[PDB]
Amino acid sequence: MRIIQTTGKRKTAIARAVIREGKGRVRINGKPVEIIEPEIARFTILEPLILAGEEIWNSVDIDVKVEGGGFMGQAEAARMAIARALVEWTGDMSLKEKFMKYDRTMLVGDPRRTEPHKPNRSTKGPRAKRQKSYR
Amino acid sequence: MAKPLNERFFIPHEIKVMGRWSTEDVEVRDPSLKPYINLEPRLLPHTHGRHAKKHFGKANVHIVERLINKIMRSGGSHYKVAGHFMRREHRSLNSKKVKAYEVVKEAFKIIEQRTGKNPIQVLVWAIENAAPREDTTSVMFGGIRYHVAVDISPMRRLDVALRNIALGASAKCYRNKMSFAEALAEEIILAANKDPKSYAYSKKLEIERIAESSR
Amino acid sequence: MAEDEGYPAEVIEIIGRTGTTGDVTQVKVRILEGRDKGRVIRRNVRGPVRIGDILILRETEREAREIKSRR
Amino acid sequence: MATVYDVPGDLLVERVAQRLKEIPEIKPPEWAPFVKTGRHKERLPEQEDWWYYRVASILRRVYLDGPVGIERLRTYYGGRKNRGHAPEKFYKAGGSIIRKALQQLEAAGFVEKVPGKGRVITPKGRSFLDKIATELKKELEEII
Amino acid sequence: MQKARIKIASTNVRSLDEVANQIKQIAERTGVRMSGPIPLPTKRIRITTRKSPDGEGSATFDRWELRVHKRLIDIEADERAMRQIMRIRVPEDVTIEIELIS
């Protein structure tokens, strides 16, 4: 084998992704990629697997550990990481251009992630105001 | 349960868009919404991904995400938990874009089985028709008030089409024993033929008709 | 449709805005697939439009359209 | 490879649930579906299914995890009691599908309580949760 | 030798590695093998108060925050080295806790 080590982060899911020579093992958090019940976020991982790694996938072992509470946050944290990991293995930069087939999240992140809540006029939430009928 | 999940995973890989449909079969022949209907997707056209770049970055959003958003809209302040529950997914989707995604997918299976065409071929044809093509804006310069003929933006046509179509579908579904999947599918069929039976064509006419009267 | 109700026309230039409403922006259109095969008209459009877009024109006969001024 | 790591859990739980009907030292006791149900529900089941999926599901977790109490199996996706117009809070589930199950996997030995104070797998519990995936490794590794 | 964990919690930004790289100076009076300062988290305390006593109308309430920033240093050395460190700990500014294991 060999070790190439990359990170992705989307939405405070942090992906610790190792790509090693293999035989087509997909492990995410210890577990199969074929356990995943939500349809939507599964399909998310599936984009680099026929748009960055047509034949590479069967041939290589990708293990990730994806540490967030999201599931489109984990799905897209993991996607960055796998996406980048596949393109390095083949040594092509012609798969860097298969991240231009959709809105960037396979190599570029967001400078803004949250706003802390404000006390407002006394009501929850960061931006908000209460109804106004004081009479 | 598990074998079905494996297969539901297989079909998009092989390659298929969304589930088992092809984006390939269309009949977009309208030059207006030619550059605002997006045919790049080959796996998913709702991820999360997004635009806030520019105003026509908004009409470059892949058609089905915009559709998901329009389907999602109504649902007030409630409380979704295991319980015994209710009611919650409203009657028009209290929950996430995640839940919204499922209906559109189901609706796509019912409508393909019926029409014997892809739901893309039906929906795309339906948006070209369902969209009104004239509006009046109140434009005064100098004091004198004219209510002259004004042309809709291409982006404004796409939004209005999507909005009418969802909105109307829901309207009979409410307090009723339909599957929504059916309701949605049936609204898309009549909107596409240009029948005044759909709520979509009603509004398409009424907006242009009022514009013709002011004009 | 595939030729519409409309008369399709493409925007040669976006001249400026009219109203004191702001609401309409005035944009110069030339038709080549619709009513005429060379006419230039200055129509009143609403909302976002930028050079090179395609605009479907419904007015080709009344030719009431306001000319002045950008404020 | 035949381990539960490799194989979607959904099938492993489903397999076990129908072989606990064959073991057959585990069954529904009368008391449990009667009113001694995990919280209150819309409709209380009379089925064999309810119980057998609940035992089958417990046997599976202790293998993948370390010690697993009876304090973290009260809810797992829901396990709430309706508090009126005040919003729902979690509450501690029926003992007649958690604790009672783990003491009949101690007459089967499949799980055991350690002198370490916890719950742990035995190899007879991993010769009954790894004989369920020797039969199939082709409809669950067709897209690994 | 005896292993000491010196755990050093500080309210100041620049008193935290200035007493975690210059407490190596205090410490050493005999030979020592020392671990470079390992950053532990900021543990964050918030306390939010109303600045308004009346509360009325619209109001803006002060959310305060004190961030206490932690470094952990290990040292393996004699009794005398450990002592230097617990003999003086200044005004605080710097809380010094010591854990003793062989």
Next chain:
Amino acid sequence: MGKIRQGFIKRVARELVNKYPNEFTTDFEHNKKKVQELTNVTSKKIRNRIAGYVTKLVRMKMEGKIL
């Protein structure tokens, strides 16, 4: 807001291209060697803006009017 700058940035940059006019550049990486030493510091972000104006000022002597 908008990209407008108050004259405090403008004040310090103007003084420095008074001393040595031709010993400043249109390159931003030399005007943070000489510049850095001379100019009033309280941040790195403030340092860049005065530095930006000393850079900009050199380009303006080229085009035939310098503030």
Next chain:
Amino acid sequence: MANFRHIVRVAGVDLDGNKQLRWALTAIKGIGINFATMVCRVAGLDPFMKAGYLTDEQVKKIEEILADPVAHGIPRWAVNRPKDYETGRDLHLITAKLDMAIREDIMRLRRIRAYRGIRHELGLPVRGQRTRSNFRRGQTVGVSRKKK
């Protein structure tokens, strides 16, 4: 089918629908959603089955189970009333029994001269907390019981 009728009477001459077994037993007072199924297991009848198509034999089973719960089982926070009138060990409730039992204890409390009791008498909540400005718009308080 599994009978010639579409309405069977069980738990007495109280009606059983054409919809669901579970729903119809809840509808008969003193026979709740949970209680329906406690009898259903003992008599033996499926949980998912249509109302309105039972054997004659089954009708007999529901009445005897209700009459003396104690023979059959029935835990001592599952039975309708345990410790009845502070001196009776156990009884049960059915439709006719539920009216009388609650009405009595309510009547008692009035006699005792309870605060709780007099408030009921007026038509007011006690442990319902507020009566402040809720039931707004001239409306009904709500309170017990069925009429739909």
Next chain:
RNA sequence: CAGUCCCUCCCGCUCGGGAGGAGGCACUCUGGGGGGACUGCCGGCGAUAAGCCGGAGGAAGGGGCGGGCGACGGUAGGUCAGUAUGCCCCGAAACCCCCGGGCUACACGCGCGCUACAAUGGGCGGGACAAUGGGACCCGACCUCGAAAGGGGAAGGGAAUCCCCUAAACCCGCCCUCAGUUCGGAUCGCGGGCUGCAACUCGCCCGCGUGAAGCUGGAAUCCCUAGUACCCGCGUGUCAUCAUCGCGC
């Protein structure tokens, strides 16, 4: 078991998947320092100025972004019922001690919230997922009895090292068969738990029965501009107890 000579465990179609300790600091991460963005550069418009648009490199850009920061003063705004304080009054008292009560009384009206009206569904079951924080008469591992509220025994932890702790939305299959109800939780009976001298008046929680009003809202009116709103749960505070509250994630 990143990566591994070593070491303990399980299964195998004995290919191969996972974890602990030696060991390793790579990675993920943590806080301290540094760099990076400034219309800096280039073209256009423009007085060659101020400034506006476009392009390139790039992770980001043209106040990058979100907060903090708010003058002289005024509405005779609010707090002498938090403290300070002018003045005036009170001295078995407008003081001082104590038990009991009320602030939630209710035909209603108005302010601010919440729950909610079912098949876009619920139940049942299974599987994938947190983050901020707080924690020694305190969090409470795990083990037993109870459907439960709770009790009994007991480990560790004054904290990246242990505990609360698995989030919830999500999704698949079945069951249900679309009523004012298996919706919805009002009110109330009986049984019980907990705190305190005590929870009728004014507590919460559970089990069994009860199951109301409500079936999509008139005039009229309110909120918000991006990681925001729509929407989902979680934590914390005050703290014996009342949360559909407040602060925060």
